[PDB]
């Protein structure tokens, strides 16, 4: 088609690959994002981790 | 300049997919073409799907059972039997028997339409191919992939049960009671997401390659082969990403 | 370090301080009736001489 | 009909097999050209690496999946030092042969089907038959010899990359110690399994090449029919690969599992 073969494929490819990379990055860290899931972080002092991960 | 050549085809595919989404959410839907393409994909990729899923799940169950029997923990086999089948065997058999059959069929059909100037016949009549052809095919691909993934998971679990119980003499109650030990709502949900994305991407790639066929005497075959290779690579990459995301949630943790 | 026995310990295994990784294990070779294990820990952390 | 189709494919495979010595003696340069074309791809797929790049990417993905899910499940249970033991038996027994077979099917088999269909449509097979040349011997037997020569390096690279991906994912992204992984990998991996896996892959590649050469050699319907032939050949190849791997694993480890952990 004329639209498919038009001389705008480079910018479309840049925008699409950027969008796909952003989607993959957000989806991977959607649970860990601080903007959408922020809770206060408290601290404790221990003599040993004791195998804690 | 070396990267600029494949980037043009990448941009064409992305723009075509964006136009397909716009036509899906804006223009009236083509129910008739969607039904026809759904039945076509079902009839072209159902029997191979079972014929690939049954021996593969039998092989996986056999390997798991022998390794666990030597390990000593042969009562937890069903756990693994579920854990693979829901999250990897289902979507991967869907990938294989969708990219190989349905995506290639869509690419061949649209290439046949292109080389016979049917796309130009539609275009000179004022009609838009992206709304009349691509949208029903992508929706049908997604629907068939969803249903086939469900069927693959069910058939794999049942075949694994029957093989393990009637051949390797494991206990049936241990198989059915340990299925939910490591598999829950997150696993079935990520499996559904994988199947939907795989079907949508396969339909998009098949349609884009079919519309841009080169004609000649080997253009359609080359287009089908490129469709198959691109679908396999893209679906494997998406499966890796979604597997990482899914194991981030986890039933065990 | 010299040990009477070094079982299931391989080069690349972690070195801990209070359970926190600070380094790794370089090599393990027999030294007579003992086992000589050369390991390393990051120079950020300090360790008592004894 | 059904018996007639089975007889036609049986005649094709018999004729292709019996002409392997004839192709080997008469056509050496053609065999070398086909070896290069299969190993390094053709057309637009050759610029990225060809069959080697596709095989590598798919096997890296499969190994990464094994390591990822394996480590996650074992860490949830707690016994996560067995990942190196779990990954190897995952790659050799089930994952790497089947995955390499499907990728080889796709790339090499679809390329062969497309090439033979294009030759059939362009009347090049008729040109060969007019010039007094056994078309099956010149084309299909040469493809079979090239595939047999090329499969062992391809599967060696596939196994190497699957192992490398599993080890890298486990010991870098998941930060497991390399010593424990290497111990549990080299302790519970038997070279006999790898040799039998190589034999399985060789047999599977021969069958796949025969199937795709059959689908491409008897193509019809112009340029449109070549794509349909490619699709049908792909379906048959998937089924055949999975069946071959299942039968070989059932025969090898039916009585002796070839794995010991307990007393």
Oligomerization state of this entry?
part of a larger assembly
Question: What is the number of E strands of chain C?
Answer: 4
Over all CA atoms, what is the radius of gyration of chain C? 12 Å
* Strand arrangement in the largest pleated sheet of chain C: 1-4-3-2
Count every helix of chain C, treating DSSP H or I runs of 4 or more residues as helices.
0
Strand content of chain C: over 45%
SSE series of chain B = HHHHHHHHH
Using CB atoms under 8 Å apart, which protein chain pair has the greatest interface? B-D, 59 and 59 residues
Number of strands of chain B: 0
What is the tally of helical segments of chain B? 9
Shape of chain B: elongated
Descriptive account of the structure:
The structure is cut from a larger assembly and holds chains A (53 residues), B (253 residues), C (50 residues) and D (263 residues). Helix content of chain A is 38%, strand content 0%. By secondary structure, chain A is mainly α. Chain A has one helix and no strands. In chain B, 55% of the residues are buried. By secondary structure, chain B is mostly helical. The longest helix of chain B is centred in the middle third of the chain and has 39 residues, at 77-115. Chain C has 50 residues and is an all-beta fold. Chain C has a four-stranded antiparallel β-sheet with strand order 1-4-3-2, with no helix packed on it. In chain C, strand 2 and strand 3 (20-31) form a beta hairpin. Chain D has 263 residues and is an all-alpha fold. Chain D is 82% helix and 0% strand. Chain D contains ten helices and no strands. The radius of gyration of chain D is 21 Å and the shape is elongated. The interface between B and D is large, with 59 and 59 residues. It is classed as membrane protein. Keywords: Membrane protein complex, ABC transporter, Virulence factor, Lipid transport, membrane protein. The entry is titled "Structure of Mce1 transporter from Mycobacterium smegmatis (Map0)". Chain A is MCE-family protein MCE1c. The organism of A is Mycolicibacterium smegmatis MC2 155. Chain B is Conserved hypothetical integral membrane protein Yrbe1a.
């Amino acid at each position: 088609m004329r639209t498919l073969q038009g001389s705008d494929r480079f910018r479309k490819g840049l925008m699409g690959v950027i969008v796909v990379a952003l989607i993959i990055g957000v989806g991977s860290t959607l649970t860990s994002v601080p903007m959408l899931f922020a809770v206060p972080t408290y601290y404790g002092q221990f003599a040993d981790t004791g195998g804690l991960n | 300049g070396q990267l600029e050549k494949p980037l043009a085809t990448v941009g064409g595919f992305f723009k075509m997919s964006v136009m397909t989404g716009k036509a899906l959410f804006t223009r009236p839907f083509q129910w008739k073409e969607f039904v026809l393409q759904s039945w076509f994909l079902i009839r072209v990729a159902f029997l191979p799907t079972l014929a690939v899923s049954i021996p593969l799940t039998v092989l996986i169950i056999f390997t798991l059972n022998i390794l666990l029997a030597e390990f000593g923990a042969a009562d937890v086999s069903g756990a693994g039997a579920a854990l693979g089948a829901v999250t990897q065997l289902g979507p991967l058999v869907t990938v294989l028997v969708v990219a190989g059959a349905g995506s290639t069929a869509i690419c061949a059909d649209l290439g046949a339409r292109t080389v016979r100037e049917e796309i130009d016949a539609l275009e000179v009549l004022g009609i838009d191919p992206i709304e009349r052809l691509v949208v029903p095919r992508v929706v049908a691909s997604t629907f068939v992939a969803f249903m086939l993934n469900g069927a693959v998971i069910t058939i794999g679990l049942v075949g694994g049960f029957f093989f393990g119980v009637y051949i390797q003499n494991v206990s049936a109650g241990a198989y059915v009671s340990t299925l939910t030990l490591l598999t829950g709502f997150p696993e079935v949900l990520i499996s559904v997401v994988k199947a939907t994305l795989f079907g949508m991407i396969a339909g998009l790639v098949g349609c884009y390659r079919g519309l841009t066929v080169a004609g000649g005497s080997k253009g359609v075959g080359t287009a089908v082969n490129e469709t198959l290779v691109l679908c396999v690579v893209a679906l494997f990459a998406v499966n890796v990403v979604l597997t990482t995301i899914g194991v981030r949630f986890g039933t065990g943790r | 370090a010299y040990f009477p026995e070094v079982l299931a310990l391989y080069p690349g295994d972690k070195v801990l301080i209070m359970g926190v990784r600070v380094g790794s294990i370089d090599s393990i070779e027999t030294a007579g009736d003992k086992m000589k294990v050369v390991f390393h820990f990051n120079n950020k952390y300090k360790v008592p001489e004894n | 009909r059904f018996l007639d189709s089975m007889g036609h494919v049986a005649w094709f495979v018999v004729q292709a097999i019996v002409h392997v010595p004839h192709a080997f003696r008469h056509y050496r340069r053609e065999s070398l050209r086909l070896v290069a074309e299969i190993g390094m791809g053709t057309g637009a797929m050759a610029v990225i690496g060809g069959t080697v790049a596709i095989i590598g990417f798919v096997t890296l993905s499969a190994g990464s999946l094994i390591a990822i899910q394996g480590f996650a499940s074992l860490g949830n249970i707690g016994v996560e030092a067995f990942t190196g033991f779990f990954a190897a038996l995952a790659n050799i027994r089930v994952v790497a042969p089947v995955v390499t077979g499907q990728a080889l099917a796709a790339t090499v088999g679809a390329g062969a089907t497309a090439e033979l269909g294009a030759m059939r449509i362009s009347e090049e097979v008729d040109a060969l038959e007019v010039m007094g040349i056994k078309s099956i011997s010149y084309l299909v037997s040469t493809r079979i010899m090239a595939g047999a020569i090329v499969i062992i390096p391809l599967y060696a690279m596939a196994i190497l990359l699957s192992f490398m991906s599993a080890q890298l994912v486990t010991t870098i992204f998941y930060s497991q110690s390399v010593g424990t992984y290497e111990h549990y990998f080299h302790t519970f991996l038997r070279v006999d399994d790898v040799m039998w896996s190589f034999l399985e892959v060789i047999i599977m590649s021969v069958i796949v090449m025969l199937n795709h050469c059959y689908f491409g050699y008897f193509a019809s319907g112009g340029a449109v029919g070549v794509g349909e032939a490619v699709g049908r050949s792909m379906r048959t190849s998937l089924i055949a690969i999975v069946l071959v791997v299942l039968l070989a694993s059932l025969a090898l480890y039916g009585t002796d599992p070839n794995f010991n952990l307990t007393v």
